[PDB]
């Protein structure tokens, strides 16, 4: 098996800049057997370049490819908004055909603090015997953010899950949703439920909380 290691994992850049992605193969391969594919989240992969440097039809000249032996590169000369997606490398010189783990090309924008909201469990869920508390972080950048659940000042662990959306199409921000699930006995055993948010855009952690019986 020929392993392909792509570099870097993430790349935050702005339209008009230069991007260069690296593809290293665990063994030496000829350039004629390398390809680059582009993938927007939710859509199928799209062929960009084959044989290291040949552009597929429709691909503009701002896309360039090269390299030899063990190291190959894809270069986007001047970045366009269309170009921000995931990029995979592939070799087809040896069976089986292997792919790199990908490089994510994200729009680099101004730091934006999240808007933090909290939602107690509904009565409909309480009659189900379960209580989920939701905390929303709306329209923030960059993607890195820390959520912590606190129940009567006891930091929670192993009882929460979070999800992050894709980079928004018009303001290039992210939003995150975190869910804390308890049994309704455990939920009614306590009073203060809090979500503490840490982010680059906040000068200090922001806490949104409520009390059972508000």
């Amino acid at each position: 098996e020929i392993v392909l290691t792509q570099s870097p994992v993430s790349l935050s850049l702005s339209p008009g800049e230069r991007a260069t992605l690296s593809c290293r193969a665990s063994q030496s391969i000829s350039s004629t057997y390398l390809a680059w594919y582009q993938q927007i989240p939710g859509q199928a992969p799209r062929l960009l370049i084959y044989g290291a440097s040949s552009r597929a039809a429709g691909i503009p000249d701002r896309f360039s490819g090269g390299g030899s032996g063990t190291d190959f590169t894809l270069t986007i000369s001047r970045l366009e908004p269309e170009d921000f997606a995931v990029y995979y490398c592939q070799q087809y010189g040896s069976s089986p055909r292997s792919f790199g783990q990908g490089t994510k090309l994200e729009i680099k924008r101004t730091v934006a603090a999240p808007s933090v909201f909290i939602f107690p469990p509904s009565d409909e869920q309480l009659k189900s015997g379960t209580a989920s508390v939701v905390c929303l972080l709306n329209n923030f950048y960059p993607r890195e953010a820390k959520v912590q659940w606190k129940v009567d000042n006891a930091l929670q662990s192993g009882n929460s899950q979070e999800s992050v959306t894709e980079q928004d199409s018009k303001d290039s921000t992210y939003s995150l949703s975190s869910t804390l699930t308890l049994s309704k006995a455990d939920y009614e055993k306590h009073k203060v439920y809090a979500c503490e948010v840490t982010h680059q855009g906040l000068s200090s952690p922001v806490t949104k909380s409520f009390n059972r019986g508000e």
Partner: protein, 226 residues
């Protein structure tokens, strides 16, 4: 011009037999190798296997013990069979053609150029379950300078996907529908939120429409303030 249509069951139990088929339009099968490639959501691409119009096959060595491929030249179709399934086989499956023609044996392969869309295949011992839709009511603690956030929690459903709209699609700006999370239970949970003017609360109705086809479920949940 060359494009694909894919069919085959997408919800199976472990150790069942997955069978998928793509019909090819706008071009004939002859002269090309056709492959199946899978992708776990959030992960990368894994080539499964390829077949030509004479039945010559080549499989990924890590899957050859439980993967076969077929071709039907009269119907311009080709098929994949995968056995001894596990939850690790849950993924999007794509059909693709090689970018250039290649006869039955050429030691180095070509690149893939036309790719079909990804069909989700779910392998799980869980049985189909419709989601519970719980309101996320706007409150004191979900307001910020004239903007109120509300939503709905789509919890304990299986399998993917679920479609979520707001006011039957008449409400789109400020909506965030989040990727689902797979719980310890084997069930999925997702949330959908929207920020609106806080003065709109009390007169403007906000309903979340959740469609889960595998369970034949459609829920219209009205979200009301505190």
């Amino acid at each position: 011009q060359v494009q694909f249509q894919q069919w085959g069951a997408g919800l199976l139990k472990p150790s069942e037999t997955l069978s998928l088929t793509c019909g090819v339009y706008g071009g004939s099968l002859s002269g090309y190798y056709w492959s199946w490639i899978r992708q776990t959501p959030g992960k990368g691409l894994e080539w499964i296997g390829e077949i030509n119009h004479t039945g010559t096959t080549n499989y990924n060595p890590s899957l050859k013990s439980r993967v076969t491929m077929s071709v039907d030249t009269s119907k311009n179709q080709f098929s994949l069979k995968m056995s001894s399934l596990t939850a690790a086989d849950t993924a999007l499956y794509y059909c693709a053609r090689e970018g250039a023609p290649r006869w039955a044996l050429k030691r180095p392969s070509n690149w893939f150029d036309p790719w079909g869309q990804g069909t989700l295949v779910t392998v799980s011992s869980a049985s189909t379950k419709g989601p519970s839709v719980f309101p996320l009511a706007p409150s004191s603690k979900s307001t910020s300078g004239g903007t109120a956030a509300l939503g709905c929690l789509v919890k304990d459903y299986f399998p993917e996907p679920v479609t979520v709209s707001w006011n039957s699609g008449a409400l789109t700006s400020g909506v965030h529908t989040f990727p689902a999370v797979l719980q310890s239970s084997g069930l999925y949970s997702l949330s959908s939120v929207v920020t609106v003017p806080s003065s709109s609360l009390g007169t403007q109705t906000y309903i979340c429409n959740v469609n889960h086809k595998p369970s034949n479920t459609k829920v219209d949940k009205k979200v009301e303030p505190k």
